[PDB]
Amino acid sequence: MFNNHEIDTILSTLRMEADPSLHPLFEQFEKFYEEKLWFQLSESLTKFFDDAKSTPLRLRLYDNFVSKFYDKINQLSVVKYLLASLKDSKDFDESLKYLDDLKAQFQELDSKKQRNNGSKDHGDGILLIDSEIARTYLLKNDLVKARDLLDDLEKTLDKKDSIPLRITNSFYSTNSQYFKFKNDFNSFYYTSLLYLSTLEPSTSITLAERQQLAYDLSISALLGDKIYNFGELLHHPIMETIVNDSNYDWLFQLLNALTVGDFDKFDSLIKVQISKIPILAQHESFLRQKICLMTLIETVFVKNIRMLSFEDISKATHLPKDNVEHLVMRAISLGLLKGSIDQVNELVTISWVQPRIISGDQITKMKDRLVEWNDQVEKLGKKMEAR
Amino acid sequence: EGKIDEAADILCELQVETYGSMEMSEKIQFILEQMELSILKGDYSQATVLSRKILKKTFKNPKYESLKLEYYNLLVKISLHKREYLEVAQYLQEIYQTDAIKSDEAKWKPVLSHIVYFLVLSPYGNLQNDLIHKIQNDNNLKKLESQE
C-alpha cells in the first residue's frame, strides 16, 4: 500500500528537502510495486522493520543509488539486506555480481573509512564476501572443494575482528551441512553448541530458527558424545516452544529412557527412518553403557570406595564382560576415567578426572566436610602458638 | 654391455676434479647417476656415503622444484634393500610440504597415502607425534581417513 511512501517521506523530509537517493521517476515507484503493507525494499530506519517477502529481484534498483545515496543513510548500508534478502533466492549469477564483482577498494578506502561487517548499520561488504562464498557453494560443491572455502574463511576470522558473534552463525551453518554430509556427527554436535550461544543477539531472534535448530540438536546429541548424554537437553528447552512430534518427540522419551535403560523404551526412540544409518547401531550401545556408568560412578563414590567390580557394570548394560572391558576404553579415551581395569582380580580401578557438573545435592555434605574436618586442623594447631 | 662394478668408480672422484666448491648444479646430475649405479650393483651402503657435502644446503637456497623431488626418490630405494621404514618417512617429509605449496593436490594426495601408511610401521616418535592431526587429510579418500 502507501506505507512505503508515507513513512519514508517523513524521515527523508526532516533530513533532505528533496530525496537525494530516490530519483523523481523512482519516487512514485516506491508505493507502486506490491499491494502489501511492507514491500521488498526500504531505506534508513524504515528498512529495519522491512525484510524479504518472496523473490526480491528489485534490489538492482536499490543498488542503482550510489552518488547521492549517502545523503540519507550512510553509503555502507547498501549491503545490509542486499545479500540477506537473497538468501532464499539461490542464484549463482546474482551472487557473483555482489561477491566477485564487488571486489575491494571501491570508493571506501579513499574518502571514507571501513568498518567491514556490512549486514548491520553501515559497513563495507568485503568481509561479507568471504562469509557468503561458503553458503552459495554449500549445495554446489562436495566435501573436496568445501575445505578450500574454509581456509580463506577461518584464517580471515583470526585476521580481523567483529563485535557481533553472528559471523560465527554463518560459519556454523556452513559446517552444519558440511558435517551433515559426513558420517561422524561428533564434530556436528560441538558446532551446534556455540551456535546456540550466539542466538541471543540480533539477526533473526525469531522462533523460525529454533524449529530447524531443534532438528539439529536432536540428531547431534543422539550420535554425538561430549558431556553426559541427555544433560544438555534440559539446559535450553527451546524445543518445547516448537512442534512436539516429527522427530522432535524422540528427545521426550530419550530423557527418561537413559535414566531407566530399558529396551522397551528404545523401540519408541528409534524408528525405521533413523535405523537406515549404520552409525546408529554403534552409538545405540554407547549411550546406554555410558549413562549406566555415570550412575555407577556416582554410586561407587561415597567416602573411601574408588573401585568397582564386574558385577554391577555388566548387569546394567546387559553385555558380556569380555566386550565391556574394551567398550569402556572407547569412552576412556574421551577423558572420563584414567583408571586401569584388571582381569584376574575382577576389580575395576578408577582414576576419576571427570568434572561431573550439575551439583547441589552434594554441596550440603560436600562443603561442610571442607570446614568441620578442616576445623580439626585448626583445633590441633592452637598448641603450636608457643612460638 | 654388462659393466657394473667399474661404472661407479669413474664418477666418484671425477666430479670433485672439475668443480669442488664452485658449481653444485653440474654436480647434481653426477651424484644422482652414481647413486643409481649402486642400486643396480646391489649395494645400498655405497650410495649413502657418496652424497655427503651437499647436505641440506639446497633447502637454504630458493626452491628449484624437481631437484628435491629426485634425491628423496633414490634414497627410498636405498632403504628398500635395508627394509628400514623409519628413514623413508623422513625422506617423504620435505616433499610433503613441497607439493602442498608449489604443486597441487594431484601428486600430493597419492604420496600422502604412503606417508601415513609408513607411520604405523614405526613406534611413533618425537616428530610423528606432531604428524597425528592434519588439516588436509580429512577429505578425499576414505582410506586416508581410515589410516588417520
Swiss-Prot record, chain A:
One of its GO terms (biological process) is proteasome assembly. GO terms for cellular component: cytosol; nucleus; proteasome complex; proteasome regulatory particle, lid subcomplex; proteasome storage granule. Keywords: Proteasome. Disulfide bonds: none annotated. It comes from the Eukaryota. The keyword Disulfide bond does not apply. InterPro entries: PCI_dom, PSD13_N, PSMD13, Rpn9_C, WH_DNA-bd_sf. Residues 187-355 form the PCI domain. It holds the Pfam family PCI. PROSITE patterns: PCI (PS50250). Present with 12400 molecules/cell in log phase SD medium. Acts as a regulatory subunit of the 26S proteasome which is involved in the ATP-dependent degradation of ubiquitinated proteins. Belongs to the proteasome subunit S11 family. This is 26S proteasome regulatory subunit RPN9. It comes from Saccharomyces cerevisiae (strain ATCC 204508 / S288c) (Baker's yeast).
From Swiss-Prot, chain B:
The chain holds residues 150 to 297 of 445 of the full protein. GO terms for biological process: proteasome-mediated ubiquitin-dependent protein catabolic process; protein deneddylation. GO terms for cellular component: COP9 signalosome; cytoplasm; proteasome complex; proteasome regulatory particle, lid subcomplex; proteasome storage granule. N-acetylated by NAT1. Present with 5710 molecules/cell in log phase SD medium. It comes from Saccharomyces cerevisiae (strain ATCC 204508 / S288c) (Baker's yeast). This is 26S proteasome regulatory subunit RPN5. Acts as a regulatory subunit of the 26S proteasome which is involved in the ATP-dependent degradation of ubiquitinated proteins. Belongs to the proteasome subunit p55 family. It comes from the Eukaryota. Keywords: Acetylation, Proteasome.
